[PDB]
Ligand SMILES: Nc1nc2c(ncn2[C@@H]2O[C@H](COP(=O)(O)OP(=O)(O)NP(=O)(O)O)[C@@H](O)[C@H]2O)c(=O)[nH]1
Ligand SMILES: [Mg+2]
């Protein structure tokens with residue numbers, strides 16, 4: 001039908017190491033929420049890991065968006081892959097979150113992508129994290145649980161999250177989900193595992209604030225994905241960063257192309273429900289006229305026409321990860337050519353070091369110039385990640401736009 005706004009909207013999602021239980025939790029959240037609010041459509045595991053290649057490889061590959069709501073708020077929830085080969089997808093997902101749920105297996109404790117996901121979430125501006133310690137059904141020893149909680153809290157502190165403060169909820173995504181299948185009307189207070197999910201929803205409700213959002217500034221929506229809807233046309237999805245978009249607005253597709261192009265918005269939807277108007281914070285699909293899915297792509301931004309100029313050259317302040325943080329073992333020189341990640345954008349760039357700076361080492365805080373091989377929507381103060389050869393090598397912030 002149409003999307004009726006009854007309450008504030010917040011974007012959350014799931015991050016964490018491969019197999020720790022992100023997707024099972026996502027499904028469990030929809031089922032638990034749905035028993036109290038009949039507007040929530042339940043999403044089973046297979047409804048989320050739905051792609052043939054996900055079934056083939058047995059992992060999440062694509063970020064999925066699901067919807068649920070509490071009495072307090074409306075949630076769009078982005079479930080991200082944990083597999084180390086799908087970090088780019090995770091980054092694009094995190095780039096949409098006003099808060100993240102970090103899933104950590106109680107049986108394994110924090111693992112390399114537990115660290116990498118916390119790191120990267122920060123670099124795309126995730127303001128808050130809640131921890132769901134999953135698979136406690138597998139762990140009898142209360143000591144290991146306390147140990148895992150401790151390790152996770154410390155790891156959050158390392159990347160400037162308030163680790164000693166974040167909620168750490170302990171439960172079983174799977175056992176809650178099973179209970180909801182046996183009784184879809186299972187209410188709060190009736191089942192131990194389901195109540196742990198309510199504990200999570202409460203923490204989300206109360207710990208992740210509703211962001212301050214500017215609907216008056218020019219429309220800007222980073223594109224997270226693009227697909228063709230049979231009968232309708234090309235849809236670009238994403239979280240509106242600022243401003244508003246109505247059907248009939250001409251917008252500009254900015255970045256990743258030599259030149260910017262204009263198109264008319266012909267539909268706006270949030271979770272397959274038609275919006276009058278999309279506003280900042282909304283996670284929407286925008287139907288674009290006259291463009292195919294080969295003419296719009298993830299990493300471009302939709303913008304008010306003329307409100308944004310894409311850039312290629314910038315100065316940056318960069319931290320280069322130690323190998324103990326999963327970074328490089330050796331240093332690099334000017335001409336180093338990794339991948340840079342800004343919000344949903346990923347693009348190859350060239351490191352150009354100052355005259356006199358010959359080599360940058362793991363663990364260095366440093367400043368240099370970057371030249372991207374394609375123009376990209378950039379702003380001063382925009383954080384970014386650096387990756388190369390399938391690992392994260394650095395964290396940076398844009399300090400000066402040169403060109
Ligand atoms: N014992 C137990 N197993 C669980 C629990 N939650 C999930 N699992 C199991 O853990 C495995 C991984 O689940 P999944 O939700 O796919 O994790 P994921 O983090 O989404 N994986 P990925 O990184 O690929 O997206 C599955 O076999 C699932 O049944 C739990 O609470 N307890
Ligand atoms: Mg998954």
Ligand SMILES: [N+]
Nearest residue numbers: 048049062064
């Ligand atoms: N998925």
